[PDB]
Scaffold this active site. Structure first.
Site, PDB file in Angstrom:
ATOM      1  N   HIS A   1       0.912  -1.116  -0.118  1.00  0.00           N
ATOM      2  CA  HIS A   1      -0.123  -0.135   0.003  1.00  0.00           C
ATOM      3  C   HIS A   1       1.031   1.296  -0.044  1.00  0.00           C
ATOM      4  CE1 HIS A   1      -2.377   3.371   1.650  1.00  0.00           C
ATOM      5  NE2 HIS A   1      -3.536   2.484   1.160  1.00  0.00           N
TER       6      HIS A   1
ATOM      7  N   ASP B   1       1.061   4.352   1.215  1.00  0.00           N
ATOM      8  CA  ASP B   1       1.375   5.017   2.583  1.00  0.00           C
ATOM      9  C   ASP B   1       2.275   4.064   3.348  1.00  0.00           C
ATOM     10  OD1 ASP B   1      -0.236   7.194   2.014  1.00  0.00           O
ATOM     11  OD2 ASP B   1      -1.979   6.336   2.984  1.00  0.00           O
ATOM     12  N   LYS B   2       1.802   2.661   3.312  1.00  0.00           N
ATOM     13  CA  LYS B   2       2.981   1.872   4.036  1.00  0.00           C
ATOM     14  C   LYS B   2       4.246   1.794   3.455  1.00  0.00           C
ATOM     15  CE  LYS B   2       1.099   0.866   8.101  1.00  0.00           C
ATOM     16  NZ  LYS B   2       2.286   1.710   8.544  1.00  0.00           N
TER      17      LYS B   2
ATOM     18  N   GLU C   1      10.664  11.844   6.388  1.00  0.00           N
ATOM     19  CA  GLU C   1       9.266  11.571   5.701  1.00  0.00           C
ATOM     20  C   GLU C   1       9.508  10.943   4.493  1.00  0.00           C
ATOM     21  OE1 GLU C   1       7.243  11.980   7.806  1.00  0.00           O
ATOM     22  OE2 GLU C   1       7.305  13.919   8.764  1.00  0.00           O
TER      23      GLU C   1
ATOM     24  N   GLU D   1      14.753  15.968   8.063  1.00  0.00           N
ATOM     25  CA  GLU D   1      15.696  16.477   9.118  1.00  0.00           C
ATOM     26  C   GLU D   1      16.379  15.208   9.801  1.00  0.00           C
ATOM     27  OE1 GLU D   1      12.508  17.537  10.224  1.00  0.00           O
ATOM     28  OE2 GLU D   1      12.382  18.557   8.295  1.00  0.00           O
TER      29      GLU D   1
ATOM     30  N   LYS E   1      -5.639  -3.466   0.645  1.00  0.00           N
ATOM     31  CA  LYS E   1      -6.428  -3.024   1.770  1.00  0.00           C
ATOM     32  C   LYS E   1      -7.388  -4.206   2.189  1.00  0.00           C
ATOM     33  CE  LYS E   1      -7.286   1.374   2.135  1.00  0.00           C
ATOM     34  NZ  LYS E   1      -7.796   2.735   1.627  1.00  0.00           N
TER      35      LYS E   1
ATOM     36  N   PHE F   1      -8.419  -3.844 -10.275  1.00  0.00           N
ATOM     37  CA  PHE F   1      -7.377  -3.085  -9.591  1.00  0.00           C
ATOM     38  C   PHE F   1      -6.025  -3.449 -10.229  1.00  0.00           C
ATOM     39  CE2 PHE F   1      -6.302  -2.625  -4.731  1.00  0.00           C
ATOM     40  CZ  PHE F   1      -4.892  -1.724  -4.830  1.00  0.00           C
TER      41      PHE F   1
ATOM     42  N   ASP G   1      -2.165   5.734  -6.375  1.00  0.00           N
ATOM     43  CA  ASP G   1      -2.501   6.672  -5.117  1.00  0.00           C
ATOM     44  C   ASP G   1      -1.230   7.024  -4.652  1.00  0.00           C
ATOM     45  OD1 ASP G   1      -4.376   7.788  -3.029  1.00  0.00           O
ATOM     46  OD2 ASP G   1      -3.685   5.899  -1.981  1.00  0.00           O
ATOM     47  N   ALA G   2      -1.081   8.202  -4.451  1.00  0.00           N
ATOM     48  CA  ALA G   2       0.210   8.772  -3.784  1.00  0.00           C
ATOM     49  C   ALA G   2       0.303   8.252  -2.491  1.00  0.00           C
ATOM     50  CB  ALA G   2       0.040  10.192  -3.557  1.00  0.00           C
TER      51      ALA G   2
ATOM     52  N   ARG H   1       0.422   8.572   7.402  1.00  0.00           N
ATOM     53  CA  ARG H   1      -1.063   8.513   6.832  1.00  0.00           C
ATOM     54  C   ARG H   1      -1.720   7.103   7.007  1.00  0.00           C
ATOM     55  NH1 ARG H   1      -2.437  12.730   3.211  1.00  0.00           N
ATOM     56  NH2 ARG H   1      -4.137  11.509   2.527  1.00  0.00           N
ATOM     57  N   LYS H   2      -1.280   6.537   7.972  1.00  0.00           N
ATOM     58  CA  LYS H   2      -1.938   5.315   8.396  1.00  0.00           C
ATOM     59  C   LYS H   2      -1.817   4.893   9.797  1.00  0.00           C
ATOM     60  CE  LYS H   2      -4.130   3.715   4.710  1.00  0.00           C
ATOM     61  NZ  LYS H   2      -4.216   5.164   4.521  1.00  0.00           N
TER      62      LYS H   2
ATOM     63  N   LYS I   1      11.230   8.433  12.917  1.00  0.00           N
ATOM     64  CA  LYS I   1      11.461   9.181  14.095  1.00  0.00           C
ATOM     65  C   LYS I   1      12.480   8.349  15.060  1.00  0.00           C
ATOM     66  CE  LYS I   1       7.233  11.625  13.566  1.00  0.00           C
ATOM     67  NZ  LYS I   1       6.126  12.125  14.176  1.00  0.00           N
TER      68      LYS I   1
ATOM     69  N   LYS J   1      11.665  11.613  19.908  1.00  0.00           N
ATOM     70  CA  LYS J   1      10.178  12.157  19.238  1.00  0.00           C
ATOM     71  C   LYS J   1       9.264  11.442  20.057  1.00  0.00           C
ATOM     72  CE  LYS J   1      13.102  13.787  15.765  1.00  0.00           C
ATOM     73  NZ  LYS J   1      14.312  14.018  16.005  1.00  0.00           N
TER      74      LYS J   1
ATOM     75  N   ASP K   1       6.266  11.260  19.941  1.00  0.00           N
ATOM     76  CA  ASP K   1       4.931  10.670  19.229  1.00  0.00           C
ATOM     77  C   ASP K   1       5.157   8.950  19.097  1.00  0.00           C
ATOM     78  OD1 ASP K   1       3.502  12.924  18.417  1.00  0.00           O
ATOM     79  OD2 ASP K   1       4.680  13.238  16.285  1.00  0.00           O
TER      80      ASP K   1
HETATM   81  C1  LIG Z   1       9.629  20.220  17.063  1.00  0.00           C
HETATM   82  S1  LIG Z   1       9.284  20.088  15.112  1.00  0.00           S
HETATM   83  C2  LIG Z   1       9.296  17.999  14.971  1.00  0.00           C
HETATM   84  C3  LIG Z   1      10.718  17.328  15.161  1.00  0.00           C
HETATM   85  C4  LIG Z   1      11.688  17.874  13.882  1.00  0.00           C
HETATM   86  N1  LIG Z   1      11.379  17.178  12.889  1.00  0.00           N
HETATM   87  C5  LIG Z   1      13.197  17.873  14.447  1.00  0.00           C
HETATM   88  O1  LIG Z   1      13.874  17.279  13.274  1.00  0.00           O
HETATM   89  O2  LIG Z   1      13.446  17.168  15.589  1.00  0.00           O
HETATM   90  C6  LIG Z   1       7.556  20.010  14.952  1.00  0.00           C
HETATM   91  C7  LIG Z   1       6.739  21.256  15.299  1.00  0.00           C
HETATM   92  O3  LIG Z   1       7.166  22.040  16.095  1.00  0.00           O
HETATM   93  C8  LIG Z   1       7.514  23.409  15.886  1.00  0.00           C
HETATM   94  N2  LIG Z   1       8.726  23.689  16.012  1.00  0.00           N
HETATM   95  C9  LIG Z   1       9.815  23.719  15.107  1.00  0.00           C
HETATM   96  N3  LIG Z   1      10.933  24.400  15.623  1.00  0.00           N
HETATM   97  C10 LIG Z   1      10.579  24.470  16.858  1.00  0.00           C
HETATM   98  C11 LIG Z   1      11.299  25.038  17.946  1.00  0.00           C
HETATM   99  N4  LIG Z   1      12.584  25.514  17.659  1.00  0.00           N
HETATM  100  N5  LIG Z   1      10.950  25.403  19.042  1.00  0.00           N
HETATM  101  C12 LIG Z   1       9.526  24.933  19.390  1.00  0.00           C
HETATM  102  N6  LIG Z   1       8.809  24.326  18.416  1.00  0.00           N
HETATM  103  C13 LIG Z   1       9.424  24.210  17.237  1.00  0.00           C
HETATM  104  C14 LIG Z   1       6.654  23.751  14.446  1.00  0.00           C
HETATM  105  O4  LIG Z   1       5.341  24.008  14.460  1.00  0.00           O
HETATM  106  C15 LIG Z   1       6.985  22.269  13.941  1.00  0.00           C
HETATM  107  O5  LIG Z   1       6.354  22.073  12.771  1.00  0.00           O
HETATM  108  C1  LIG Z   2      -8.947   4.312  -3.745  1.00  0.00           C
HETATM  109  S1  LIG Z   2      -7.318   4.861  -3.640  1.00  0.00           S
HETATM  110  C2  LIG Z   2      -7.933   6.608  -2.803  1.00  0.00           C
HETATM  111  C3  LIG Z   2      -8.177   7.704  -3.972  1.00  0.00           C
HETATM  112  C4  LIG Z   2      -7.374   7.784  -5.045  1.00  0.00           C
HETATM  113  N1  LIG Z   2      -6.516   8.827  -4.671  1.00  0.00           N
HETATM  114  C5  LIG Z   2      -8.285   8.621  -6.156  1.00  0.00           C
HETATM  115  O1  LIG Z   2      -7.568   9.334  -6.901  1.00  0.00           O
HETATM  116  O2  LIG Z   2      -9.327   8.544  -6.311  1.00  0.00           O
HETATM  117  C6  LIG Z   2      -6.610   4.677  -1.937  1.00  0.00           C
HETATM  118  C7  LIG Z   2      -6.215   2.968  -1.877  1.00  0.00           C
HETATM  119  O3  LIG Z   2      -7.170   2.271  -2.365  1.00  0.00           O
HETATM  120  C8  LIG Z   2      -6.374   1.042  -3.020  1.00  0.00           C
HETATM  121  N2  LIG Z   2      -6.913   1.155  -4.219  1.00  0.00           N
HETATM  122  C9  LIG Z   2      -6.200   1.836  -5.470  1.00  0.00           C
HETATM  123  N3  LIG Z   2      -6.787   1.567  -6.509  1.00  0.00           N
HETATM  124  C10 LIG Z   2      -7.626   0.734  -6.392  1.00  0.00           C
HETATM  125  C11 LIG Z   2      -8.887   0.041  -7.047  1.00  0.00           C
HETATM  126  N4  LIG Z   2      -8.648   0.296  -8.419  1.00  0.00           N
HETATM  127  N5  LIG Z   2      -9.523  -0.887  -6.399  1.00  0.00           N
HETATM  128  C12 LIG Z   2      -9.572  -0.675  -5.395  1.00  0.00           C
HETATM  129  N6  LIG Z   2      -8.757  -0.213  -4.184  1.00  0.00           N
HETATM  130  C13 LIG Z   2      -7.766   0.452  -4.923  1.00  0.00           C
HETATM  131  C14 LIG Z   2      -5.023   1.374  -2.942  1.00  0.00           C
HETATM  132  O4  LIG Z   2      -4.389   0.670  -1.751  1.00  0.00           O
HETATM  133  C15 LIG Z   2      -4.874   2.838  -2.525  1.00  0.00           C
HETATM  134  O5  LIG Z   2      -3.439   3.253  -1.756  1.00  0.00           O
END
Ligand SMILES: C[S@@+](CC[C@H](N)C(=O)[O-])C[C@H]1O[C@@H](n2cnc3c(N)ncnc32)[C@H](O)[C@@H]1O
Ligand SMILES: C[S@@+](CC[C@H](N)C(=O)[O-])C[C@H]1O[C@@H](n2cnc3c(N)ncnc32)[C@H](O)[C@@H]1O
Ligand SMILES: Cc1[nH]c2c(N3CCCCC3)c(-c3ccccc3)nn2c(=O)c1-c1ccc(O)cc1
Ligand SMILES: Cc1[nH]c2c(N3CCCCC3)c(-c3ccccc3)nn2c(=O)c1-c1ccc(O)cc1
Lengths: 382, 382
Positions: free
Chosen positions: A16, A18-19, A44, A57, A168, A237, A245-246, A251-252, A272, A276, A278
């Site tokens: 998938h 996203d995965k 990311e 980063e 899915k 499919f 699909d991007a 996103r999961k 991460k 982090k 999270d």
């Molecule tokens: C802390 S950053 C997530 C971790 C980061 N990706 C890293 O490389 O460590 C997440 C969010 O916190 C905020 N942020 C960024 N720089 C920060 C800073 N110096 N102090 C506090 N919050 C910050 C921004 O809103 C950012 O999108």
């Molecule tokens: C349906 S697509 C999301 C909507 C899509 N972004 C669009 O442009 O309509 C989301 C997920 O469903 C699955 N998918 C993609 N094509 C599909 C298809 N033809 N039939 C069923 N599931 C599908 C894949 O796992 C994909 O990541």
């Protein structure tokens, strides 16, 4: 019917889109950690037709070959030919990676004792456990994950060679109330959608999905004449993976956790390092929740924690036992205080979070599997 | 203390990098819908230093100038100079947009009557409402959003000219149990982090955040000598926006909804037209939940729905009233069945989901604000 309700969870396969991104982000994390246990990683991944982009980063002493790490992860997933829509050998890998912001670094970890490192961000995180399965997870999500794993198994073993990596699944279970806990009764509906080759027909696919996938995963005692099956419900499919699909990392997040049960604070896990919260605090909160259930204190429990960037101790800790504990909520909080230290610089030691095991977490859920450290309950003193 | 608990929610500002992406994705959606009400849009946005990338799938009769749409959205947010870390005039805008997969199109909407269009994907979605505020939202998330809005207001009006657009806030409230409903008592902790210029000092910032932001938002009756304040807790936040942290669409899904309350099915909202049930069915589920509360049937309620790709009617519908209804769960489900039709091709009519109002939803939460159609309760017949 009195006392019953329906609940639905979903899961997705290794291919998938996203995965794919979650797995690549954690392959990058692992590659850094193999060389630098203290790497700061916020990677990311974005996937679309022919493209993996890494953005984020990283500050690390490691020397990582991003082309190799990315392509090997895609190869593992199974995208190895233009006929499947994506090929690790020939895709574009683009890198937009910078150092960690020095302002974050100075406020979080620079010149700090490890145990007293600050949280890497603010946020809230939850841990959940339910006694309805031995692994203390909701049946809906467990079954959904196992359906995707079965597809990957039958693809890899050549049983169903028309399968492709993008899939899915979705499972609806009828539950019975049981004094605040929940008891699964039956499977009401199953959805499976999986990418497939151009030659196989819908009837061959639907028959195989019922007989070789569903029946090989879901106990017959849960399935009956009324169970509803939506197998290849889109009808076609062939286009799939990033081409269909991007994909993006993170996103999961509900698939990664409890399938909608419990609660979620919004943070993604993959890509991460331990600073982090999270990820690390969600893992620790799972560990707490599972320890309370396996310790016989609760049948079902939800734990919330929260942090401020730069501050080591949680700002808040809260517990809800759904009416399934003889101890009060106050008493449970005291037990958690006496038995756990939820500073990130202590979680890292308790859960071994510098170890490069993260790619293994990035499909089929982070919880309920494989006896990771956060799945081994702590013996509680009280 | 007996009967009380703490709960934390967070929010982010318009220039938080994830929220930038949500807003751009919805600016793109709106631009398409202005010309083609039936545009099929799945637009992800990625942001890092100097870069906005659009990735995804759009099939539309519109002619959209992506450079202009993106740059105008960034200008609105306030990133207009290299000194702030990002500038709409000079950033890179890259586009990786393809048509919607023909396999999806044929299975979802091709040659289908509009009311009988299939769901654009499988998935699960929840709607929640709570009587603890007039707008039927949790106080924790409302206050967190209003703190970010106040920062943007004082930035735009020139009161606090050292402010920049990237901010995060977090609010912990002590609640009292009230027969399944919840009653806010006091604010326990507030976090505010906001990007700032190189010249202002921490003491000036912390004083302003307390006196001009917190006191201008949070009623004094909730604040006391014990309230904990974490204001600029990292100590320095000059680097911010995408330069400080990568942004992606759909990475603030808990901020977008209920701040952790209720439940979430995992789907993101921004960048998606009405056939993507992740958005339309979540909006409809909110509408149902709010209608049940404003109709006096529940004080607090959670609704789940789920779908299969290509299938119009929900696969499941479920309700939990937290013990706050005199009607049974069965009776509530019957009321919802008789009063709502949750096919996407009907939701679109009831909630006017071809209208280009989506950019307005993409900061400060999608719910509890501005009398959008899903916030206007339906009068229920029973
Ligand atoms: C802390 S950053 C997530 C971790 C980061 N990706 C890293 O490389 O460590 C997440 C969010 O916190 C905020 N942020 C960024 N720089 C920060 C800073 N110096 N102090 C506090 N919050 C910050 C921004 O809103 C950012 O999108
Ligand atoms: C349906 S697509 C999301 C909507 C899509 N972004 C669009 O442009 O309509 C989301 C997920 O469903 C699955 N998918 C993609 N094509 C599909 C298809 N033809 N039939 C069923 N599931 C599908 C894949 O796992 C994909 O990541
Ligand atoms: C009946 C019931 N329903 C229910 C719901 N529903 C299910 C359907 C959709 C909406 C949420 C959730 C929930 C699920 C996920 C996230 C958040 C909340 N928890 N939950 C319950 O605990 C009970 C209950 C259990 C045992 C008992 O003795 C008495 C009541
Ligand atoms: C005490 C209590 N706690 C509680 C929790 N907590 C809060 C702290 C962290 C963990 C979850 C949530 C919850 C919050 C978000 C998502 C999912 C579940 N709901 N909830 C309750 O309904 C009650 C309750 C209310 C009225 C009553 O008369 C009896 C009990």
């Amino acid at each position: 019917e009195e006392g019953t309700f329906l609940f639905t969870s979903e899961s997705v396969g290794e291919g998938h889109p996203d995965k794919i991104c979650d797995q690549i982000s954690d392959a990058v994390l692992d590659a850094h950690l193999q060389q630098d246990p203290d790497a700061k990683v916020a990677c990311e991944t974005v996937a679309k037709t022919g493209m993996i982009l890494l953005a984020g980063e990283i500050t690390s002493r490691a020397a990582v070959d991003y082309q190799k790490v990315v392509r090997e992860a895609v190869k593992h997933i199974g995208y190895d030919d233009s006929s499947k829509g994506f090929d690790y050998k020939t895709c574009n890998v683009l890198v937009a990676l910078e150092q960690q912001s020095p302002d974050i670094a100075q406020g979080v970890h620079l010149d700090r004792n490890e145990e007293d490192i600050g949280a890497g961000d603010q946020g809230l995180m939850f841990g959940y456990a339910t006694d309805e399965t031995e692994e203390c997870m909701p049946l809906t999500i467990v079954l959904a994950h196992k359906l995707n794993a079965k597809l990957a198994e039958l693809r890899r073993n050549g049983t169903l060679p028309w399968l492709r990596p993008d899939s899915k699944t979705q499972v609806t279970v009828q539950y019975m109330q049981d004094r605040g806990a929940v008891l699964p009764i039956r499977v009401h509906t199953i959805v499976i959608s999986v990418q497939h080759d151009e030659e196989v027909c819908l009837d061959e696919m639907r028959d195989a999905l019922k007989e070789k996938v569903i029946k090989a995963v879901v106990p017959a005692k849960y399935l009956d004449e009324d169970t509803i099956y939506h197998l290849q419900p889109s009808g076609r499919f062939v286009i799939g993976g990033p081409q269909g699909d991007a994909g993006l990392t993170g996103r999961k997040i509900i698939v990664d956790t409890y399938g909608g049960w419990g609660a979620h604070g919004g943070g993604a896990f993959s890509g991460k390092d331990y600073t982090k919260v999270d990820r690390s605090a969600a893992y620790a909160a799972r560990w707490v929740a599972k320890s309370l259930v396996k310790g016989g204190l609760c049948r079902r429990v939800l734990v919330q924690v929260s942090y401020a960037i730069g501050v080591s101790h949680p700002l808040s800790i809260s517990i809800f036992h759904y009416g399934t504990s003889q101890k009060s909520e106050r008493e449970l909080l005291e037990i958690v205080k006496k038995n756990f230290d939820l500073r990130p610089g202590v979680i890292v030691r308790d859960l071994d979070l510098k170890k490069p095991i993260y790619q293994r977490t990035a499909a089929y859920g982070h919880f309920g599997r494989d006896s990771f450290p956060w799945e081994v309950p702590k013996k509680l003193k009280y």
